[PDB]
Short mmCIF file of C-alpha atoms in Angstrom, two decimals:
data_model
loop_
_atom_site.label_atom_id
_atom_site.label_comp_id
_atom_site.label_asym_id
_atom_site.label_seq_id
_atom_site.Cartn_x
_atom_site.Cartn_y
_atom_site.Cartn_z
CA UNK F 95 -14.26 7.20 -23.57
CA UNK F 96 -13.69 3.28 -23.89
CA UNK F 97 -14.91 1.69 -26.94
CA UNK F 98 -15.89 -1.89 -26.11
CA UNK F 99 -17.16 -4.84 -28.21
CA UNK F 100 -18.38 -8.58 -26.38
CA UNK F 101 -17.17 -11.64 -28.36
CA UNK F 102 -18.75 -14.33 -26.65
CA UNK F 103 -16.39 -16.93 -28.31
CA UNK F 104 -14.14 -15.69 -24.96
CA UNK F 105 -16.73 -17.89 -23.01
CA UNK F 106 -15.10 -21.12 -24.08
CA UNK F 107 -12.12 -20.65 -21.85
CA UNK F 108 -14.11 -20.06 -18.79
CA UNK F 109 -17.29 -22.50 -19.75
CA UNK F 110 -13.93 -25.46 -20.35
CA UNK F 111 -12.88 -24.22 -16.57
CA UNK F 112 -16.68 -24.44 -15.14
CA UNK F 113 -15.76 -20.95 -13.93
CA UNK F 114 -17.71 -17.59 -13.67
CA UNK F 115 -15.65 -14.42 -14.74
CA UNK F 116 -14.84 -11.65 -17.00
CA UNK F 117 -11.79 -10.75 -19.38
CA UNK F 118 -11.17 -7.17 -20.78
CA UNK F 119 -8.07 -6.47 -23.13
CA UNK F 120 -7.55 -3.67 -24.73
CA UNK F 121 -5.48 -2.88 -27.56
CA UNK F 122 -3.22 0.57 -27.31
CA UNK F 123 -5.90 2.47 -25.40
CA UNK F 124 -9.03 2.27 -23.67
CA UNK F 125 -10.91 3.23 -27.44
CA UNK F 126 -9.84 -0.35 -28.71
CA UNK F 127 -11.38 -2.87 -25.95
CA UNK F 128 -13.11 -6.53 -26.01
CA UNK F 129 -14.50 -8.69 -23.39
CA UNK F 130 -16.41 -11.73 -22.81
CA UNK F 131 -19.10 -10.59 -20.98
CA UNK F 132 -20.25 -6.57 -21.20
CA UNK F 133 -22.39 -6.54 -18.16
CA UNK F 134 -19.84 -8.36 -15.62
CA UNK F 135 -16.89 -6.10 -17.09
CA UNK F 136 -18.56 -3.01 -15.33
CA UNK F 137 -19.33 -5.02 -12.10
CA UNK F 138 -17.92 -3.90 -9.26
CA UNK F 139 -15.84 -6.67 -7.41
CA UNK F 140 -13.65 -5.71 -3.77
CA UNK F 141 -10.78 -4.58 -5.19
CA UNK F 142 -8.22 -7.03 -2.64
CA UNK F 143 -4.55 -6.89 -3.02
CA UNK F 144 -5.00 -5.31 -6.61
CA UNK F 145 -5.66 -2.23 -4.23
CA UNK F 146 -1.81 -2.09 -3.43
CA UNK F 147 -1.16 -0.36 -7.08
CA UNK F 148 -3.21 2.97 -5.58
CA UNK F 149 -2.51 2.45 -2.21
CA UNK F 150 1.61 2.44 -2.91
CA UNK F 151 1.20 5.73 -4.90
CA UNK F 152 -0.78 7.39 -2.14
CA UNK F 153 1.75 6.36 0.37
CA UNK F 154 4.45 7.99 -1.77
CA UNK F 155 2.56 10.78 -2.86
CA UNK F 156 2.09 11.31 0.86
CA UNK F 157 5.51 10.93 2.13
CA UNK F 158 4.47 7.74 4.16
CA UNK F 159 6.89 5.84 1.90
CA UNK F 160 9.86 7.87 2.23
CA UNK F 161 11.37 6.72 -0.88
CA UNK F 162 11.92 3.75 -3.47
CA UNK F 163 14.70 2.30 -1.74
CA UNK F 164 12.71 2.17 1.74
CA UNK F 165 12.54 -1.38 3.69
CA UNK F 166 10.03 -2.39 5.03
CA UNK F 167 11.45 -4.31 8.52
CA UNK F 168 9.44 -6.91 9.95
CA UNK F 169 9.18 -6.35 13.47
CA UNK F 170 9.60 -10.62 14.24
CA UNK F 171 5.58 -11.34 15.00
CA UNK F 172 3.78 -14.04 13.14
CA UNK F 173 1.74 -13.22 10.14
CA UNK F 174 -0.60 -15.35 7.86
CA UNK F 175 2.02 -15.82 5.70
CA UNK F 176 5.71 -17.47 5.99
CA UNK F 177 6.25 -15.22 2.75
CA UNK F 178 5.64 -12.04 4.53
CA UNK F 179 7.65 -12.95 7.45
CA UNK F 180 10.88 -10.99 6.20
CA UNK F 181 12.51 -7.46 5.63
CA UNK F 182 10.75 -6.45 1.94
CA UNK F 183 11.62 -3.63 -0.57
CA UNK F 184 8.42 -2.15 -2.08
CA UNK F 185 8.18 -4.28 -4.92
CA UNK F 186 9.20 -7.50 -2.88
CA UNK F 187 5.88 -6.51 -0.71
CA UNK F 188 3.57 -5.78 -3.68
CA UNK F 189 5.16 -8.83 -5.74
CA UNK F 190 4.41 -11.19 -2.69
CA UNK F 191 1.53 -9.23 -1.16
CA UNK F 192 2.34 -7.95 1.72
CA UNK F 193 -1.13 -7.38 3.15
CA UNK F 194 0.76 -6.06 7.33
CA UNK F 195 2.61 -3.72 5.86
CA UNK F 196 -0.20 -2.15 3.48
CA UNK F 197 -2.17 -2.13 6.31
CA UNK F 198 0.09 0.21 8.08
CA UNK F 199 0.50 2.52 4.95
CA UNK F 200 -2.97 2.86 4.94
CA UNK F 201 -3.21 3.58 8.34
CA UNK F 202 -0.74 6.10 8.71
CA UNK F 203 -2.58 7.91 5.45
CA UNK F 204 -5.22 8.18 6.99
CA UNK F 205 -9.54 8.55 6.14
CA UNK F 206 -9.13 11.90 4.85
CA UNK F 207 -6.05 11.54 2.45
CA UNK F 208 -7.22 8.03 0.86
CA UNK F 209 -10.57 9.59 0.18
CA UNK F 210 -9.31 12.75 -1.56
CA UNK F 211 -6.85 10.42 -3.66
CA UNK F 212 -9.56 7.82 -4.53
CA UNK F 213 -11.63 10.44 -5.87
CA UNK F 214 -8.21 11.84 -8.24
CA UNK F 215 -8.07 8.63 -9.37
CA UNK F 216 -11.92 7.62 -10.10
CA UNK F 217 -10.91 4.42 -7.68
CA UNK F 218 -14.28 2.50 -8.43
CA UNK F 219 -17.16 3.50 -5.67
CA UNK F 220 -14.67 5.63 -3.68
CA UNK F 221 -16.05 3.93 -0.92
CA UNK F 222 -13.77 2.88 2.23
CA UNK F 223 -15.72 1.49 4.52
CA UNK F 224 -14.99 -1.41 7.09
CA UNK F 225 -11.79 0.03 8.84
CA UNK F 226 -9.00 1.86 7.05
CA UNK F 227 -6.90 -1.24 7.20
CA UNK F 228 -9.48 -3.63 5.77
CA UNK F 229 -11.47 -1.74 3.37
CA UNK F 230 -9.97 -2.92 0.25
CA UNK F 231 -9.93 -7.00 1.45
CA UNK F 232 -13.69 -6.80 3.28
CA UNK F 233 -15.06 -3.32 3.44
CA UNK F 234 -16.82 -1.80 0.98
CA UNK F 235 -14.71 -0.56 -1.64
CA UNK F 236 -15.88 -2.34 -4.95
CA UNK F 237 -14.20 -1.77 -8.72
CA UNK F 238 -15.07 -3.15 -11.76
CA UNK F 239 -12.71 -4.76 -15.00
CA UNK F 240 -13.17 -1.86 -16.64
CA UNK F 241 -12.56 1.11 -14.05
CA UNK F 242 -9.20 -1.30 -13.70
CA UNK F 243 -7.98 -1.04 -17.04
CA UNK F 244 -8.55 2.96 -17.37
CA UNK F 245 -6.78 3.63 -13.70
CA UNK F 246 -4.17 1.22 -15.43
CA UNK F 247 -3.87 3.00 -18.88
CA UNK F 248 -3.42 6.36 -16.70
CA UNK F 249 -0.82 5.12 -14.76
CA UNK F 250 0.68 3.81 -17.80
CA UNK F 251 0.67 7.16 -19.24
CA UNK F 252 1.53 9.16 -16.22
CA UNK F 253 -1.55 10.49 -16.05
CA UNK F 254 -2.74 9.98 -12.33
CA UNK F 255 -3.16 13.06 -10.49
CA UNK F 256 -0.01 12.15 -8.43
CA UNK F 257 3.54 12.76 -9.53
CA UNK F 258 5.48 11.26 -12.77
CA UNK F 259 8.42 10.06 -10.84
CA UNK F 260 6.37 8.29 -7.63
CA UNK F 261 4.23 6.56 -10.79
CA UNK F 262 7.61 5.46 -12.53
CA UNK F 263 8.45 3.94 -8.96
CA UNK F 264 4.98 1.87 -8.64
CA UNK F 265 5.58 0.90 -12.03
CA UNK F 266 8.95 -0.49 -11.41
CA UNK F 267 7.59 -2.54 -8.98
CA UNK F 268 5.02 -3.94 -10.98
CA UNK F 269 7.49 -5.42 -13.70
CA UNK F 270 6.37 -9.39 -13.51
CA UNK F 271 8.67 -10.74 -16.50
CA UNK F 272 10.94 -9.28 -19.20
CA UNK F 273 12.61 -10.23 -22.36
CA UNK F 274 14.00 -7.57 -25.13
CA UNK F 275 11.30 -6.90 -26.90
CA UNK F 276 8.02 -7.98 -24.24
CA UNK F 277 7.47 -6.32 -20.74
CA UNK F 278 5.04 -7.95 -18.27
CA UNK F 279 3.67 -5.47 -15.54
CA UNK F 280 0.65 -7.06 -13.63
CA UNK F 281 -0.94 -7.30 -10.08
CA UNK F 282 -2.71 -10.18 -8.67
CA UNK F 283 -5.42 -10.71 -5.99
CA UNK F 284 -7.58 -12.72 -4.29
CA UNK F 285 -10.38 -12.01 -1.50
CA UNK F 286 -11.05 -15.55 0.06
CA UNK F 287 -13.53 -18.52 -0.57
CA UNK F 288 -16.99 -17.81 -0.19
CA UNK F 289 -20.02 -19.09 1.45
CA UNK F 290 -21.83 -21.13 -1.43
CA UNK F 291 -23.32 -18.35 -3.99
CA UNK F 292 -21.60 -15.93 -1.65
CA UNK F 293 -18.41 -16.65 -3.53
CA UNK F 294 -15.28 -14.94 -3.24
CA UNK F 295 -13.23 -13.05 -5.83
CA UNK F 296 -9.67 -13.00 -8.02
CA UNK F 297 -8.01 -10.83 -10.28
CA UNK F 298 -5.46 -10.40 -12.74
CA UNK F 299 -4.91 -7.11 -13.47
CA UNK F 300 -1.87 -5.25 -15.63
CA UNK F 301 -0.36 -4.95 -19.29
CA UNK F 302 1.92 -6.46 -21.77
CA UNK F 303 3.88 -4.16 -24.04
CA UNK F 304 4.92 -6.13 -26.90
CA UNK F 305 7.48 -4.68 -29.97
CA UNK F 306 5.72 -1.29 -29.83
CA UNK F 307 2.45 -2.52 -29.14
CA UNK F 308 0.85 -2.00 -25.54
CA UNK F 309 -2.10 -4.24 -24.11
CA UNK F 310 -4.21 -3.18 -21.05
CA UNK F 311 -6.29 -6.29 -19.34
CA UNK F 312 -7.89 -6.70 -16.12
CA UNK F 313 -10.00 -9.95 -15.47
CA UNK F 314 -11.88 -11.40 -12.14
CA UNK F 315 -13.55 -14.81 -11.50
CA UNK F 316 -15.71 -16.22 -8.53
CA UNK F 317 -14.07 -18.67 -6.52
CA UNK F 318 -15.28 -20.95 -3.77
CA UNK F 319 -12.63 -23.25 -3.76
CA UNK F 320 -8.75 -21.77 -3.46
CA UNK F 321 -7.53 -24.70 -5.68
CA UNK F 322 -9.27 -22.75 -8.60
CA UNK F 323 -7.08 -19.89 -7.81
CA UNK F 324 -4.48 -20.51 -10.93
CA UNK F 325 -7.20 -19.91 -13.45
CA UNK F 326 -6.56 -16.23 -12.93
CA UNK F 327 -3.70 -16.10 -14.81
CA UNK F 328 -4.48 -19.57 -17.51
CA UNK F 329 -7.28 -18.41 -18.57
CA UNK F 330 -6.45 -14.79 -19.42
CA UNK F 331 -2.73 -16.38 -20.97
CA UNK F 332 -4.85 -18.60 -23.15
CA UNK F 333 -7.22 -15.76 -24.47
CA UNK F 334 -3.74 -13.38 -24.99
CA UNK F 335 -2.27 -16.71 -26.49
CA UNK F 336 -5.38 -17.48 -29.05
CA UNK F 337 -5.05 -13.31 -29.78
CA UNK F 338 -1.24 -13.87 -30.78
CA UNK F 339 -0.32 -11.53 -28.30
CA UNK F 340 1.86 -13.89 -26.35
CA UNK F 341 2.45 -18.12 -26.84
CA UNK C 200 35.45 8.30 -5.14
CA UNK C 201 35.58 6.12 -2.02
CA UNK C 202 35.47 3.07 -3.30
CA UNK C 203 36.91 0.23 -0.94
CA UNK C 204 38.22 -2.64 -3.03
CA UNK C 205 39.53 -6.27 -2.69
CA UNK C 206 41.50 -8.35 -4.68
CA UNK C 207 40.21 -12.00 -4.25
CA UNK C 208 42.12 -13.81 -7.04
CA UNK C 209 40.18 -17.15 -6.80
CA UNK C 210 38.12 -15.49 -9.46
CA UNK C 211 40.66 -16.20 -11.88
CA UNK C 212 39.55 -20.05 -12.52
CA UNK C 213 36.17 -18.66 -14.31
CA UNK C 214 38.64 -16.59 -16.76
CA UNK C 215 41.62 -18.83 -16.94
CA UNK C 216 38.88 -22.05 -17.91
CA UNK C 217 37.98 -19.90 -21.07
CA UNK C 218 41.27 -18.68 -21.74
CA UNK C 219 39.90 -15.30 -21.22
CA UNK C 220 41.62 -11.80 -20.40
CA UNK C 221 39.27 -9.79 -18.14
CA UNK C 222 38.20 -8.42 -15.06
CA UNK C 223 34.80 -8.65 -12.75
CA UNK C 224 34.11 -5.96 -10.27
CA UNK C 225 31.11 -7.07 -7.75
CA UNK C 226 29.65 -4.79 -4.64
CA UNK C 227 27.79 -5.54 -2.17
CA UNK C 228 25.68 -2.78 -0.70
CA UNK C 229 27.91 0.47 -2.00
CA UNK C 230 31.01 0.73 -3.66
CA UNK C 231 32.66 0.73 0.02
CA UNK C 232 32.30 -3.01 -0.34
CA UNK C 233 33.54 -4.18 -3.37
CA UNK C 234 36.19 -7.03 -4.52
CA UNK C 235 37.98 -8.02 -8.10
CA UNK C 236 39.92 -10.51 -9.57
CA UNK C 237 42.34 -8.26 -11.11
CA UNK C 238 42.99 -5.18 -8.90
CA UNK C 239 45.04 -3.41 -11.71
CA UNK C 240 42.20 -4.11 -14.52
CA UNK C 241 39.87 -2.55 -12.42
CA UNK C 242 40.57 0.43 -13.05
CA UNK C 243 42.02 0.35 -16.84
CA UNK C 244 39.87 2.31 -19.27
CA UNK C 245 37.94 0.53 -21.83
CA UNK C 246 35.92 1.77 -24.94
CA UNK C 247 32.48 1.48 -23.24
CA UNK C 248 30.44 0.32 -26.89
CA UNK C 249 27.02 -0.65 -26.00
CA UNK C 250 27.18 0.32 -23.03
CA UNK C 251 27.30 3.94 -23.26
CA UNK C 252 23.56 3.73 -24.07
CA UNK C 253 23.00 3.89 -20.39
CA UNK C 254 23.94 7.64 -20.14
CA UNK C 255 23.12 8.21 -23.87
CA UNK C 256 19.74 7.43 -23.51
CA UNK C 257 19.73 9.37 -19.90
CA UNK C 258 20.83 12.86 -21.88
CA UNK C 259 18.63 12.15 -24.94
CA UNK C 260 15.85 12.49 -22.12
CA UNK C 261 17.56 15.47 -20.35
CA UNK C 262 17.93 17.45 -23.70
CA UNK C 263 14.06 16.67 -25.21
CA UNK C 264 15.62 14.52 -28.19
CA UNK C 265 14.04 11.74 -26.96
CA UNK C 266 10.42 13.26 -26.07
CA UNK C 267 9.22 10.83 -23.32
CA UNK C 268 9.20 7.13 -22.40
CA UNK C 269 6.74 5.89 -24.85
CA UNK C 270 8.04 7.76 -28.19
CA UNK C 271 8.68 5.21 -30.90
CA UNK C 272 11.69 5.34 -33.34
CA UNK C 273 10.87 3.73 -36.93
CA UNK C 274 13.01 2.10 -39.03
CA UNK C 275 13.35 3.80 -42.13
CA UNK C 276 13.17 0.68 -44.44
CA UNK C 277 16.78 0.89 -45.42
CA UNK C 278 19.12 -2.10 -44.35
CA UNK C 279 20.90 -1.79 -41.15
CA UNK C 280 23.48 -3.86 -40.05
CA UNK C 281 21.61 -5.91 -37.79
CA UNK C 282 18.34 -7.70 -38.75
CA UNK C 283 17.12 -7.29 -35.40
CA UNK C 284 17.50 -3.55 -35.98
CA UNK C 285 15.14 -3.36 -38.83
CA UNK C 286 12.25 -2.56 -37.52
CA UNK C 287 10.29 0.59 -35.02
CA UNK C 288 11.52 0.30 -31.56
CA UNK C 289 10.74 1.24 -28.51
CA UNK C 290 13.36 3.41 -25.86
CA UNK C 291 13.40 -0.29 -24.08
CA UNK C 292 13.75 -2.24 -27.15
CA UNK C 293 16.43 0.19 -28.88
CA UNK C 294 18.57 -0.81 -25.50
CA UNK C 295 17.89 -4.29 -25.45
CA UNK C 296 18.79 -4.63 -28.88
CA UNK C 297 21.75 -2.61 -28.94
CA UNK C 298 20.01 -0.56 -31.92
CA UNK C 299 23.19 1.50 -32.62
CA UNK C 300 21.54 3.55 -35.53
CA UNK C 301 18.95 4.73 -33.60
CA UNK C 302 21.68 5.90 -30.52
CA UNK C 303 23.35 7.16 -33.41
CA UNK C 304 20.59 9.68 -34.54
CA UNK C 305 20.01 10.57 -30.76
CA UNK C 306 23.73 11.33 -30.29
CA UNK C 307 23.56 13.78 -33.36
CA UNK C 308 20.85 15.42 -32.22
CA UNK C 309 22.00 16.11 -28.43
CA UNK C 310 25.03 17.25 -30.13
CA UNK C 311 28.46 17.43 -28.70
CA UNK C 312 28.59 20.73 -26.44
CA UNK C 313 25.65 18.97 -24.46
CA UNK C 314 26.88 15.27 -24.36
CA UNK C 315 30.12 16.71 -23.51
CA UNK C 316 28.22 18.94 -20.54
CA UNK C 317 26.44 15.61 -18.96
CA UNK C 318 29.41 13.36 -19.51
CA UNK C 319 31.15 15.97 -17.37
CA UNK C 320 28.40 15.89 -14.93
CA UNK C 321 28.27 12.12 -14.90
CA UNK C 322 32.03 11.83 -14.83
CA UNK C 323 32.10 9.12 -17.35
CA UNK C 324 35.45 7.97 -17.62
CA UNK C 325 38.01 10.04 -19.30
CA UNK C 326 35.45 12.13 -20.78
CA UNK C 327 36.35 12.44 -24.61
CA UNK C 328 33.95 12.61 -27.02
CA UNK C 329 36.67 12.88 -29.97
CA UNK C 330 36.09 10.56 -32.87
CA UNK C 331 33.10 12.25 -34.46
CA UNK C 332 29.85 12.92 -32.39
CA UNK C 333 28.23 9.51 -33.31
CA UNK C 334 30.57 7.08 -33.09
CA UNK C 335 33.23 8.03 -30.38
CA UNK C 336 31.62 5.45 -28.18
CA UNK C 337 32.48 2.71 -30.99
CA UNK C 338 35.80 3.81 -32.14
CA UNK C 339 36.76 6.93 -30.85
CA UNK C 340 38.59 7.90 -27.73
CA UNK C 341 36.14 7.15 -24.96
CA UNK C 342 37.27 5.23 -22.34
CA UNK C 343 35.80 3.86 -18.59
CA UNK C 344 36.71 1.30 -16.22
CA UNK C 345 35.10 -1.39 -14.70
CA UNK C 346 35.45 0.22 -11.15
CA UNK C 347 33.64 4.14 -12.68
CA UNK C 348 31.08 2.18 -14.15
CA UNK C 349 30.38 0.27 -11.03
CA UNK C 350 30.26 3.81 -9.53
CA UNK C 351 27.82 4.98 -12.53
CA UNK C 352 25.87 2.48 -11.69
CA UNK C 353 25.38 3.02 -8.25
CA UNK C 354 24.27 6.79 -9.12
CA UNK C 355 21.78 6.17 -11.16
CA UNK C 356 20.46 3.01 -8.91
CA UNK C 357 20.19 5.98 -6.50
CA UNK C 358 18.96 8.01 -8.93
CA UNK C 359 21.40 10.38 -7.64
CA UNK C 360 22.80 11.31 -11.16
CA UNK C 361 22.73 14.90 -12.27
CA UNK C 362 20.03 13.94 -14.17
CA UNK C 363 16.17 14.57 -13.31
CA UNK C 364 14.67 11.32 -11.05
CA UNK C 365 12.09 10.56 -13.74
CA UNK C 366 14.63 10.56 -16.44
CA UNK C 367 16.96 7.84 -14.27
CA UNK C 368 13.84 5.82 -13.21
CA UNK C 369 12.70 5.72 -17.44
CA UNK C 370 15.82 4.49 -18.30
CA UNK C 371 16.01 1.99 -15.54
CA UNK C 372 13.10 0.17 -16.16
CA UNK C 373 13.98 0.32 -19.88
CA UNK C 374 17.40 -2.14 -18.85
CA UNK C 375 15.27 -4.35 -16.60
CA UNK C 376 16.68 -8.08 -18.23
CA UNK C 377 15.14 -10.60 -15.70
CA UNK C 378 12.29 -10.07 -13.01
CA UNK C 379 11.01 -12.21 -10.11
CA UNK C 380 9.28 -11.65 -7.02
CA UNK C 381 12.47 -10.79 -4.82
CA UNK C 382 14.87 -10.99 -7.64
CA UNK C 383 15.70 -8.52 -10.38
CA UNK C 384 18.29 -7.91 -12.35
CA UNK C 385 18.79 -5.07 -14.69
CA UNK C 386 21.44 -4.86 -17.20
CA UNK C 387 23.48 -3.95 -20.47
CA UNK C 388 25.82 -5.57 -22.79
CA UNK C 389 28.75 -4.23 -25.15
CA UNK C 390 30.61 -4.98 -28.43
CA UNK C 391 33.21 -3.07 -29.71
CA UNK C 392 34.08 -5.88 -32.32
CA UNK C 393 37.30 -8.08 -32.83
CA UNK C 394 40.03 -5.34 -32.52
CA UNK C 395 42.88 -5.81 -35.18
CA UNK C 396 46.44 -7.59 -34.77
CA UNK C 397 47.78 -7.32 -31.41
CA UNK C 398 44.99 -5.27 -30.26
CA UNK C 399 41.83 -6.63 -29.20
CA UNK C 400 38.57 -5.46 -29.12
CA UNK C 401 36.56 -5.24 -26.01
CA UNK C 402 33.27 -7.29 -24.46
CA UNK C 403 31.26 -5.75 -21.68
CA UNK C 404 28.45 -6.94 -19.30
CA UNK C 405 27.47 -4.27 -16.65
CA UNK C 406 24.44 -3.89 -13.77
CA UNK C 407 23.25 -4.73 -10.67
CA UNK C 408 20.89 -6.95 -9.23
CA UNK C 409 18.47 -6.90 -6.49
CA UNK C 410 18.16 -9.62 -3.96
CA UNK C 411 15.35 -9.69 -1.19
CA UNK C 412 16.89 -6.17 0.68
CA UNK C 413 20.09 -6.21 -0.61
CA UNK C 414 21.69 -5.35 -4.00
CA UNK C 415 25.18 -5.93 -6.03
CA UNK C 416 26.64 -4.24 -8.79
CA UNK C 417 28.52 -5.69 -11.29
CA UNK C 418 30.59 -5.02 -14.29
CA UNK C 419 32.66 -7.31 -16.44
CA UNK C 420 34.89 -6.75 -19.47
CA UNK C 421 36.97 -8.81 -21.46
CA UNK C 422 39.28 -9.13 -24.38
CA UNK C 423 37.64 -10.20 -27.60
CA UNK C 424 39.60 -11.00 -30.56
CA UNK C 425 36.09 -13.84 -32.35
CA UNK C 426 33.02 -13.27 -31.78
CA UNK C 427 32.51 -16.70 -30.76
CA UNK C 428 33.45 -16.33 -27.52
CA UNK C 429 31.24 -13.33 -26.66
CA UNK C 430 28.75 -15.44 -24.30
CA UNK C 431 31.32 -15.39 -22.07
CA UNK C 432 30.55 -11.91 -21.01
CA UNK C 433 27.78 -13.22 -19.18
CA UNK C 434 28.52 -16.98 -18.24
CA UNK C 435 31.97 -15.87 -16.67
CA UNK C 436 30.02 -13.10 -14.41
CA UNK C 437 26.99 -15.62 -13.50
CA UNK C 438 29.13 -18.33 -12.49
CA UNK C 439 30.61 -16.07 -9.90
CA UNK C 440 28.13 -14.36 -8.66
CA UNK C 441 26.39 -17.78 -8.36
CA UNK C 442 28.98 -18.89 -6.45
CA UNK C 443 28.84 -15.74 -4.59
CA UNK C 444 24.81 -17.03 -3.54
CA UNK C 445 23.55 -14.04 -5.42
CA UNK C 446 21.94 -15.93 -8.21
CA UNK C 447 21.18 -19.46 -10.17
#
């Protein structure tokens, strides 16, 4: 039922940035939305590690993550990462990205129960592809700005078809920064470079709450070049900022 | 409880710079690894002020006078003795403010055979809600220690409170008061004001904090006869637990 309206003066921040992308915020609900660019907010991008909201809830919601207070142990084998190379709570592997251990949550899910819960969830094309341990980074699993902010604005509401509590625990471990009266939840991700005009993708996905105000936002850009990779959170920040949401 | 508890007196420099009167109870892990500068303070009972929104807002939940985690509470337009009260709030901003009047309202409503019930169930210090169903947290005969709060604490952490698990988990993320990537912190201040001759009033700071896979909890309290000195309720705690490694 989203109500959204293009303002093209959004452009500037992304013309000023030479960048290709879309911004959609959304004020209180999905009725009161406003993007950049119309046709690339219902593009369909691979989802990457913006797939660990979903993919935590199924793994609680199937009793492959025990509980909240489970730790993940790393078992002392190299990873891509020195940040992943460490004992990590749930949110310390969603806040840094954990992509080893998500892979093994997924795995141990399995086809059959990550299909059925992408479908409860209207999880872009409910696709799955590659392997179950890749689908999300380069299989074919695709979601667009928009599907992101309404799977957002239901699990803001408690209104994924998976239990209150295990959406309060996701939740907790989305919290990105806090002060008394504003509340930062928000997931970040990033696919790779990409081969010329076969670019790769990032996101910056969550919402602000703000006095008693709540703001839903989800934005992606191409990128070809991993120095670019900070203009997924500037350029959404300065478009809150001109808004007076934040700044 | 089972608390295991050391007395590491060392602490006392942070207190005795400020010329303060107070305790700091730190655990690492549980509450069977805890340590204090002043064993006997530990365990004296303190009005909790502020910080019996914790549990307040916890039962408001339990009882349906606080609908859900999203209902709004709006200011009436009348003055209220903070500025920073006058205005609609939030469950989270009604904390972090320390909105008393709207805690007030809830209190009223849940009523006192019901708050008595979950302060029972929570066994919040000595248990007595005397002093009027609003206010007994402010200036009535309430009382907790350091060490049951640390305890408290730990419960609802666990979210082993009698109490349902989405209830705990609202009200946790509602006192979440600093968030990185593999360091949180959430946590609640108190107030009771400046006491009267001979007869202070009380400061509290009380929480835990999360550290890659380990956490702490903490709770401080101090006498407080001027207000001027109430930052110390959290510079005194963050300068040990910084010297502890834990933070800063």
């Amino acid at each position: 039922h989203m109500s959204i309206t293009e303002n093209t003066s959004w452009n500037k921040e992304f013309s000023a940035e030479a960048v290709n992308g879309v911004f959609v915020l959304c004020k209180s609900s999905s009725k009161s939305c406003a993007t950049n660019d119309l046709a690339r907010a219902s593009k369909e991008y691979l989802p990457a590690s913006t797939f660990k909201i979903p993919n935590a809830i199924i793994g609680l919601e199937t009793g492959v993550i025990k509980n909240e207070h489970q730790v993940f142990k790393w078992d002392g084998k190299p990873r891509a990462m020195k940040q992943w190379e460490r004992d990590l709570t749930l949110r310390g592997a969603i806040q840094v990205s954990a992509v080893p251990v998500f892979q093994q949550i997924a795995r141990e899910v399995g086809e059959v129960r990550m299909q059925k819960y992408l479908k409860k969830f209207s999880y872009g094309n409910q696709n799955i592809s590659g392997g179950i341990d890749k689908f999300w980074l380069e299989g074919q699993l695709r979601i667009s700005a928009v599907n992101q902010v309404e799977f957002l604005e239901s699990l803001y509401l408690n209104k994924l078809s998976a239990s209150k509590e295990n959406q309060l625990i996701v939740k907790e471990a989305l919290v990105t920064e806090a002060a008394p009266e504003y509340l930062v939840h928000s997931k970040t991700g990033f696919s790779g470079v990409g081969t010329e005009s076969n670019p790769g993708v990032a996101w910056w996905v969550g919402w602000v709450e703000k006095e008693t105000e709540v703001y839903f936002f989800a934005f992606n850009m191409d990128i070809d070049n991993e120095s670019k990779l900070p203009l997924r959170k500037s350029i959404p920040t300065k478009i809150m900022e001109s808004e007076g949401i934040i700044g």
